[PDB]
Design a protein around this ligand. Structure first.
Ligand code: GTP
Ligand code: PHE
Ligand code: MG
Ligand code: MG
Ligand code: MG
Ligand code: MG
Ligand code: MG
Ligand code: MG
Ligand code: MG
Ligand code: MG
Ligand code: MG
Ligand code: MG
Ligand code: MG
Ligand code: MG
Ligand code: MG
Ligand code: MG
Ligand code: MG
Ligand code: MG
Ligand code: MG
Ligand code: MG
Ligand code: MG
Ligand code: MG
Ligand code: MG
Ligand code: MG
Ligand code: MG
Ligand code: MG
Ligand code: MG
Ligand code: MG
Ligand code: MG
Ligand code: MG
Ligand code: MG
Ligand code: MG
Ligand code: MG
Ligand code: MG
Ligand code: MG
Ligand code: MG
Ligand code: MG
Ligand code: MG
Ligand code: MG
Ligand code: MG
Ligand code: MG
Ligand code: MG
Ligand code: MG
Ligand code: MG
Ligand code: MG
Ligand code: MG
Ligand code: MG
Ligand code: MG
Ligand code: MG
Ligand code: MG
Ligand code: MG
Ligand code: MG
Ligand code: MG
Ligand code: MG
Ligand code: MG
Ligand code: MG
Ligand code: MG
Ligand code: MG
Ligand code: MG
Ligand code: MG
Ligand code: MG
Ligand code: MG
Ligand code: MG
Ligand code: MG
Ligand code: MG
Ligand code: MG
Ligand code: MG
Ligand code: MG
Ligand code: MG
Ligand code: MG
Ligand code: MG
Ligand code: MG
Ligand code: MG
Ligand code: MG
Ligand code: MG
Ligand code: MG
Ligand code: MG
Ligand code: MG
Ligand code: MG
Ligand code: MG
Ligand code: MG
Ligand code: MG
Ligand code: MG
Ligand code: MG
Ligand code: MG
Ligand code: MG
Ligand code: MG
Ligand code: MG
Ligand code: MG
Ligand code: MG
Ligand code: MG
Ligand code: MG
Ligand code: MG
Ligand code: MG
Lengths: 60, 205, 82, 85, 393
RNA sequence: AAUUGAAGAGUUUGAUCAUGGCUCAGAUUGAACGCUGGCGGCAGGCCUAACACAUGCAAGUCGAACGGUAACAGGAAGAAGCUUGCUUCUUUGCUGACGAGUGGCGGACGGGUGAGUAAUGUCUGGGAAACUGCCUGAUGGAGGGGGAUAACUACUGGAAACGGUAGCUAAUACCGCAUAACGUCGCAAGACCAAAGAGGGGGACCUUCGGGCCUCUUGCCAUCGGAUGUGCCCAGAUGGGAUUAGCUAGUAGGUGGGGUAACGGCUCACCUAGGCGACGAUCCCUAGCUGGUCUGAGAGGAUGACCAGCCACACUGGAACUGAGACACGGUCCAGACUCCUACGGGAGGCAGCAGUGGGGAAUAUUGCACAAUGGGCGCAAGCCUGAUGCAGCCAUGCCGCGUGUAUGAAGAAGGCCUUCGGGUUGUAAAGUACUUUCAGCGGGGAGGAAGGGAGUAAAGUUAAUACCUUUGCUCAUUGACGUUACCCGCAGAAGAAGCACCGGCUAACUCCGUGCCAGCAGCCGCGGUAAUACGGAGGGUGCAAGCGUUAAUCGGAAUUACUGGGCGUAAAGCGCACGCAGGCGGUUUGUUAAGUCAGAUGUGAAAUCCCCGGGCUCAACCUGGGAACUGCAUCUGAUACUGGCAA
RNA sequence: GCCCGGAUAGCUCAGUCGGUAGAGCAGGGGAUUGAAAAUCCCCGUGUCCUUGGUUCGAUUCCGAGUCCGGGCACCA
């Protein structure tokens, strides 16, 4: 499958083990899944204060 | 469990007096009431059909100090029971212990009456009770134990009950701080302002 | 072997024994032919506490069925004329 | 096995030697009647029948043979004798 | 796992030290057989120490293989480090636990390059005492030539900060004492006397809170994941909560069982080498390098000030300066980790053989306190030791 | 005292009304994930590999089955040392007890899991040809001998598991003999069929002093019983596919022999060439079924984790044996695969019992304590056994309760944010003065779950008997895993105790900076091209709050499979047109008719779950009493308009 | 625990056996446009995976790491 990687900036490169959730993008033709951030090897996006359950970031 | 925040802000959002920050002082007039919910208080709401229903539910919640998970279970009980669903909701809200203790006068505010119930001060039919949501059936005798009786957060608050409307359905001795819950609360006695019709709509869908 | 015995229903730390006529091989809360009242050891001096239908015991014991250690005490408790 | 109730294995083996000896004994005395049947009088068959009649009931009462089986074995075999001979 | 290990006699963590193909596995194997027969310990053999396809096709020690033998006075727990150039990291984990060492020199060859590097590594980590054992002897039947090697070993120790002449240099073969020769059996029983006499009873920490650095992880088929290591301080009890802290993140757990060389323990105290079993943790997530602390005490950090003492050519280190951006290996308790150096204000360069403070930013988080020490290494050679000044994180 | 129930919105267009998909609001889950976490109460907690297993642990039990005092601990006739009762010690069922092993009865239940199975199964309702251990009603008997045969020696085989030979010995194990009948067979006359004693106490008589004899208790075999079981049979109901149309040879039926507890192609022997199939056989895929659960106004739709009934399976394939009952989870015998052991000859074992492991995985727990209660196994009882159970731990995984202060408090302080720089706003928020002490922390009082069992004592039964035995009062000494229990009292003191989504519309809630079709958002429409309410941050707000969102899953809204409840001129949709077999439907009058139909009656519709009213945990989840409900189903008796038959 | 392999500008790749890094595509700036494309005029836009050593000088010579790739084992 193809999975859309959300947020600004990511850790993925070639391999890396990643958790995948459901959710189409409605933009790229065919990409029908979302790569979950925080889970396993895809770490959280740097400096996201608002909305951090999505994007897997902790408190300051 | 509770709000535990700016109380008098919640009165400005709805507009009407919710009896939150009442206390020993009679009237507030010390908050710019009505026309300042938040920062953008000069704005005026258009307010849709969902709005008017939601604001009515949100008002009746914050007056009695109940959260939506607990409130939704109060609605389901009213749907089961016979008669008018609207009048049953307010009957169940009035039947709480923290609300009955507030109407007696043993507690200047409702948050005071809630904490006074919680701290093993309130007794009822000889049994000590710590739950605000204790469903008070008719023909009861709520009272304060001799430890908490005649302390300096009750006698001052009981003088406010002279100024208050004083409901018909209950009686107070005001000698040995003793109470007597006589019968159930009727619709026509209390309220005479807050709407029951709009809240029954919201949950039916 | 058909036996009149307690089934043990109810919550944790607050038991409620359904006295019941069932086969011995069958489980504690397994099958039964029919119940015959109940027992509760946490009633106190109040309205209700224990029940036992004396007519149904005369049917099963008269035919052939054992009475367990606790149910033997409940037939003594209700009495004949005391 | 990992149990001291294996006594039943060596008890059942000691049983089935005893059981199958009397089991086979029974069904030869029955076959001895079937030898007389085909070509024989009510005499060769009857003498053979009167030998197996006591033994089959003693087996039936023991519990090896179930008395209904014995009730067939007399009845269904007497029907051979009485009809033909 | 059956017999309960009764706490009789003081525990002493011992290990051998030496050059490659120079006597070590044979020395330990001789100590195992000799002490079994006379004093009445457990038997064992040379085959059980070093094993697997990798340590036979070549015939060398790669992993740290341990032994447990007993004497009348004390109880010992031996460690055989690999002794070779490529496997110096897992050597340090065995050497870190060691209190009293058994250095091995050979009367044929004498001192070798790695015999110097081993002793240079030991002092910076933590090896107070040391004993020499000349492990060949019989290969040269001559009184004059053998005693010339004894003189050379005193020079190695005395040069690199030790007693030197006071250290007991015992002599004798391992192979002859292994099979059973009356004259050579008794000469290794003399080495057992020097282990008791020279090395004192080590002072343990049975007061300050519980800690346990992991030297190597195991996976027992039945019970779960087990972690071996010396209890550096405090005490463990079967049932207590144990917060795992170190590389990756920070996990909660409970001590299922403590053991000492396949024997049960209730109170595994400080000093002794024990294998702790964990509650519901896998072999993958727990890594070699992490620590088992008591909940709330220690906290993981990846940034710290430390008064590092860099060495020059005289002691054994670098011979050139270096600007910020330099990334050597830091050996804290057991395992290595890389970290960039950030120098203070008004310090342009760091010359060799100087005392300075520096902020070091590690790539992984490792647990640390004010008072801990380490030994820096880079390019197959040492750099310099230090001590932690302040926590930053 | 038992039903008071049905909402819409966005989205094709320049706009409109249709048609029609798509999306959203609500419920729910065995859920996971991300961000966060204080407690208590009751529930739950491998959905994937029925993939593989180390370790411990899940079924034993009686001396009331009889020798044996084989071991062990006491006593007693007697002995030897010497501190002549202090110690050595041989005999003794007279007690306590208790064997590698022979018997009796249990292991087939209780637990676990859904691999198979689309009908052999399951559900509902009937049925004739059956057996049913212990429990238990009744009527009689309960005669007398035999051989062995394990223990136990001996001599021996072996590493072990585990034998072998030759002797001795008991019985409720085993076998004949008399003795039998409403038991069995035959048309009848007849023939035939069974057993076991143990256990406590004792007056007379009788003692070869073995005891006979009485007596109670239990215990024993024959039969008609009872109940609970279990076996079988038929009817309907019980998924999807016709891009699966013909299948079937013991196949379908007979007569005869055998076999089964019992009927039957269950099985041989002829005889006969039928039986199933468009009201779906065969074949293929998928699947444990049901009570129920979720959802729905209901009809339905989905589903069958947990609690409970039935079936099926127990490393894979197969078979029988022992038993009343198994073709047997922790039995036997074979083969296979796969791990262990070995002295290389040969032998072990089965976690889809409880814990735990690795592995698979998005993902699910302690290698705990207890028999104190509740049944379960054997027991006269005393007890003993139990990962059935009852607790405890772990896990916000659910459902629910209480927390996280409470009044007063204007200088409308300070700091942040906006600005028309006048001020507004964050905000009675905060700081102070008056006052509590739920729950956490500490120390004391302290129930209720425990009913009984043990000894002794008087009476009533029982007997020759004030003795034992059976029953009933009645005194004493006690029996608790949970347990620092539930609960109560005091102690100190604001003390320990709040997040995380969203803020263009649907949908409650606004500005300012940063970025400039870039970076990014999103459930739909869509936002971003230098003044962004949609992106990122900031302050403010909204809704939820110890939970909140995201993901997946089912119904709902969807009258978007429409029976209730849609359509088919042009939007998707009338075969190109006839003839016509099965199939559906049928003008009209008078009969009868009891199939539809309706009406009543009876039993059944397991219990829980649901709904109504009560009772109990301080309240609620939770538990629980009663009733209705279980919309049905089968038969029985009617009504006879309408439907159908045969009629005129 | 150890054996090996892999990494060159925003992406896809030449380069070397010591002389100070290229190719194509992309992207940025200016004129046009509300903003782009094309059209016209100018720009490598590089920690040679990171970091030390042998050298006057290293992507290219030699160590030590990083994460990832695949291989082999130990079993308190
Ligand atoms: N003749 C003799 N040979 C010896 C002696 N000690 C050791 N050896 C030899 O050295 C070999 C053992 O080498 P080890 O020292 O065990 O090798 P290693 O384990 O790589 O050594 P480390 O690197 O120190 O771990 C044996 O094969 C012996 O033949 C001795 O005393 N006499
Ligand atoms: N504590 C361990 C030490 C050990 C480590 C590694 C291998 C063997 C032994 C014992 O056993
Ligand atoms: Mg709540
Ligand atoms: Mg149960
Ligand atoms: Mg019983
Ligand atoms: Mg046995
Ligand atoms: Mg046989
Ligand atoms: Mg024969
Ligand atoms: Mg034969
Ligand atoms: Mg024969
Ligand atoms: Mg028998
Ligand atoms: Mg070695
Ligand atoms: Mg070599
Ligand atoms: Mg439209
Ligand atoms: Mg448009
Ligand atoms: Mg096993
Ligand atoms: Mg056990
Ligand atoms: Mg046991
Ligand atoms: Mg036993
Ligand atoms: Mg026993
Ligand atoms: Mg018998
Ligand atoms: Mg079963
Ligand atoms: Mg279970
Ligand atoms: Mg399970
Ligand atoms: Mg289960
Ligand atoms: Mg019958
Ligand atoms: Mg029997
Ligand atoms: Mg006899
Ligand atoms: Mg006899
Ligand atoms: Mg004879
Ligand atoms: Mg003889
Ligand atoms: Mg004889
Ligand atoms: Mg002979
Ligand atoms: Mg004899
Ligand atoms: Mg017998
Ligand atoms: Mg008859
Ligand atoms: Mg007859
Ligand atoms: Mg007659
Ligand atoms: Mg007759
Ligand atoms: Mg007899
Ligand atoms: Mg008995
Ligand atoms: Mg009896
Ligand atoms: Mg009997
Ligand atoms: Mg035909
Ligand atoms: Mg509907
Ligand atoms: Mg399950
Ligand atoms: Mg059946
Ligand atoms: Mg089998
Ligand atoms: Mg049989
Ligand atoms: Mg079976
Ligand atoms: Mg098993
Ligand atoms: Mg079994
Ligand atoms: Mg067999
Ligand atoms: Mg298990
Ligand atoms: Mg596991
Ligand atoms: Mg016990
Ligand atoms: Mg019994
Ligand atoms: Mg009994
Ligand atoms: Mg006794
Ligand atoms: Mg057991
Ligand atoms: Mg146990
Ligand atoms: Mg009891
Ligand atoms: Mg957003
Ligand atoms: Mg802007
Ligand atoms: Mg936003
Ligand atoms: Mg529908
Ligand atoms: Mg339509
Ligand atoms: Mg239409
Ligand atoms: Mg058209
Ligand atoms: Mg058309
Ligand atoms: Mg046409
Ligand atoms: Mg057609
Ligand atoms: Mg036509
Ligand atoms: Mg036509
Ligand atoms: Mg037709
Ligand atoms: Mg017709
Ligand atoms: Mg008609
Ligand atoms: Mg009629
Ligand atoms: Mg009817
Ligand atoms: Mg039934
Ligand atoms: Mg029911
Ligand atoms: Mg209910
Ligand atoms: Mg009920
Ligand atoms: Mg009921
Ligand atoms: Mg009833
Ligand atoms: Mg019907
Ligand atoms: Mg019917
Ligand atoms: Mg009539
Ligand atoms: Mg008529
Ligand atoms: Mg008609
Ligand atoms: Mg322009
Ligand atoms: Mg512009
Ligand atoms: Mg372009
Ligand atoms: Mg361009």
């Amino acid at each position: 499958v193809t999975s859309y990687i959300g947020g600004e900036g990511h850790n993925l490169q070639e391999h890396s083990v990643i958790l995948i959730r459901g959710g189409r993008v409605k933009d790229l033709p065919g990409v029908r899944y979302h790569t979950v951030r925080g889970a396993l090897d895809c770490s959280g996006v740097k400096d996201r204060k608002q909305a951090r359950s999505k994007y897997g970031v902790k408190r300051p | 469990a509770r709000y535990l925040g700016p109380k008098l802000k919640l009165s400005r959002r709805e507009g009407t007096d919710l009896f939150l920050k009442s206390g020993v002082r009679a009237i507030d007039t010390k908050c710019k009431i009505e026309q300042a919910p938040g920062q953008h208080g000069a704005r005026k709401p258009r307010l849709s059909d969902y709005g008017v229903q939601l604001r009515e539910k949100q008002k009746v919640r914050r007056i009695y100090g109940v959260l939506e998970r607990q409130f939704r279970n109060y609605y389901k009980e009213a749907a089961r029971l016979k008669g008018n669903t609207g009048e049953n909701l307010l009957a169940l809200l009035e039947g709480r212990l923290d609300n009955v203790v507030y109407r007696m006068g043993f507690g200047a505010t409702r948050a005071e009456a809630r904490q006074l119930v919680s701290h093993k001060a309130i007794m009822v039919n000889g049994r000590v009770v710590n739950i605000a949501s204790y469903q008070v059936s008719p023909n009861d005798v709520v009272s304060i134990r001799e430890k908490a009786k005649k302390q300096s957060r009750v006698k001052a608050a009981l003088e406010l009950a002279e100024q208050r409307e004083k409901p018909t359905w209950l009686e107070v001795d005001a000698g040995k701080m003793e109470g007597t819950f006589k019968r159930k609360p009727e619709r026509s006695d209390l309220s005479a302002d807050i709407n029951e019709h709009l809240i029954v709509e919201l949950y039916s869908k | 072997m058909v036996t009149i015995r307690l089934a043990r229903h109810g919550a944790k730390k607050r038991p409620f024994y359904q006295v019941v006529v069932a086969d011995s091989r069958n489980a504690r809360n397994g099958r039964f032919i029919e119940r015959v009242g109940f027992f509760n050891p946490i009633a106190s001096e109040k309205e209700e506490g224990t029940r036992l239908d004396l007519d149904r015991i005369a049917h099963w014991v008269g035919q052939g069925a054992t009475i367990s250690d606790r149910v033997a005490a409940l037939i003594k408790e209700v009495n004949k004329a005391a | 096995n990992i149990k001291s109730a294996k006594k039943r294995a060596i008890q059942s083996e000691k049983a089935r030697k005893h059981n199958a000896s009397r089991r086979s004994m029974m069904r030869t005395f029955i076959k001895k009647v079937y030898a007389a049947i085909e070509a024989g009088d009510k005499a060769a068959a009857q003498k053979a029948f009167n030998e197996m009649q006591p033994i089959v009931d003693r087996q039936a009462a023991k519990g090896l043979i179930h008395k209904n089986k014995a009730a067939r074995h007399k009845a269904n075999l007497t029907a051979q004798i009485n009809k033909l001979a | 796992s059956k017999e309960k290990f009764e706490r009789t006699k003081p525990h002493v963590n011992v290990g051998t030290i030496g050059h490659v193909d120079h006597g070590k596995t044979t020395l330990t194997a001789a100590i195992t057989t000799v002490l079994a027969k006379t004093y009445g310990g457990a038997a064992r053999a040379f085959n059980q120490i070093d094993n697997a396809p990798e340590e036979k096709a070549r015939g060398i020690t790669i992993n740290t293989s341990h032994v447990e033998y007993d004497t009348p006075t004390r109880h010992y727990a031996h460690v055989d480090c690999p002794g070779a150039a490529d496997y110096v990291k897992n050597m340090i984990t065995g050497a870190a636990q060691m209190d009293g060492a058994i250095l091995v020199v050979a009367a044929t060859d004498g001192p070798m390059p790695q015999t110097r590097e081993h002793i240079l590594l030991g002092r910076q980590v933590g090896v107070p005492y040391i004993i020499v054992f000349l492990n060949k002897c019989d290969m040269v039947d001559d009184e004059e030539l053998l005693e010339l090697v004894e003189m050379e070993v005193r020079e190695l120790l005395s040069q690199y900060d030790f007693p030197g002449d006071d250290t007991p240099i015992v002599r004798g073969s391992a192979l002859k004492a292994l099979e059973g020769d009356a004259e050579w059996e008794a000469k290794i029983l003399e080495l057992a006397g020097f282990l008791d006499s020279y090395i004192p009873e080590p002072e343990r920490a049975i007061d300050k809170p519980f800690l346990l650095p992991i030297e190597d992880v195991f996976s027992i088929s039945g019970r779960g994941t087990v972690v071996t290591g010396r209890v550096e301080r405090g005490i463990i009890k079967v049932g207590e909560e144990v917060e795992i802290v170190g590389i990756k993140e920070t996990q909660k757990s409970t001590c299922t069982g403590v053991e000492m060389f396949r024997k049960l323990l209730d109170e595994g105290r400080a000093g002794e080498n024990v294998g702790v079993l964990l509650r519901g943790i896998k072999r993958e997530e727990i890594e070699r390098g992490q620590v088992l602390a008591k909940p709330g005490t220690i906290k993981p950090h990846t940034k710290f000030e430390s008064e590092v003492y860099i060495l020059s050519k005289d002691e054994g280190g670098r011979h050139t300066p270096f600007f910020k951006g330099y990334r050597p290996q830091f050996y804290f308790r057991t395992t290595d980790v890389t970290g960039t150096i950030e120098l203070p204000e008004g310090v342009e360069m760091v010359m060799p053989g100087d005392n300075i403070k520096m902020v070091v930013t590690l790539i992984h988080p490792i647990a640390m306190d004010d008072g801990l020490r380490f030994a820096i290494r880079e390019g197959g050679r040492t750099v310099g030791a230090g001590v932690v000044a302040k926590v930053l994180s």
